[PDB]
UniProtKB/Swiss-Prot annotation:
Residues 1-147 form the Globin domain. This is Neuroglobin. The lineage of its organism: Eukaryota, Metazoa, Chordata, Craniata, Vertebrata. GO terms for cellular component: cytosol; mitochondrial matrix. The keyword Cytoplasm applies. Its main location: cytoplasm. Its EC number is 1.7.-.-. Predominantly expressed in brain. Phosphorylated during hypoxia by ERK1/ERK2. Phosphorylation regulates the heme pocket hexacoordination preventing the association of His-62 with the heme metal center. Thereby, promotes the access of dioxygen and nitrite to the heme and stimulates the nitrite reductase activity. Phosphorylation during hypoxia is stabilized by 14-3-3 proteins. It is an enzyme of class 1 (oxidoreductase). The gene is Ngb. Induction: Up-regulated upon oxygen-glucose deprivation.
Amino acid sequence: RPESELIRQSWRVVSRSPLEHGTVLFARLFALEPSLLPLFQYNGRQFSSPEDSLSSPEFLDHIRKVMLVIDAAVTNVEDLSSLEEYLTSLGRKHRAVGVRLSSFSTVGESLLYMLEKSLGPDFTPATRTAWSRLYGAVVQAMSRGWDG
Ligand code: HEM
């Protein structure tokens, strides 16, 4: 496809340094939606502030995990049916550790921001569209995980 290459080449710059880009993604996330902050419960503490999240090794390990799932989605961009079953468990595994569904849209907007910031003009409207389609299929898979 056109779309599949737009994804792959955009993701290339990001995969150089997933934690750095993932940190943008999560900092944006809490900027948009500070109420997600308590859902990362790591040794019975809530982060008080967004920046607290940035000092948690477990939060950063979570950033790595997020980026690796998106990396898988990119590897399978031509056919995402192969990751559907995982993504559904991930969604289930989300709700099971407490996380809400609505907020995955906010993750998607955060991902787009991170790409846009990282790629600047190379992030064309068609890349945005393609990413929005890629990520949208991730979330649709994942949403099955909230059985229904
Ligand atoms: C609002 C968004 C999110 C919140 C609040 C959140 C929170 C959590 C929490 C609390 C866990 C359990 C503790 C941990 O393993 O770090 C978890 C696990 C996980 N999250 Fe997220 N998460 C979110 C989004 C995402 C997204 C978008 C992805 C991937 C695209 C992702 C990938 C994972 C993975 C891979 C795990 C480990 C799951 C397993 O046990 O197999 N998360 N997340």
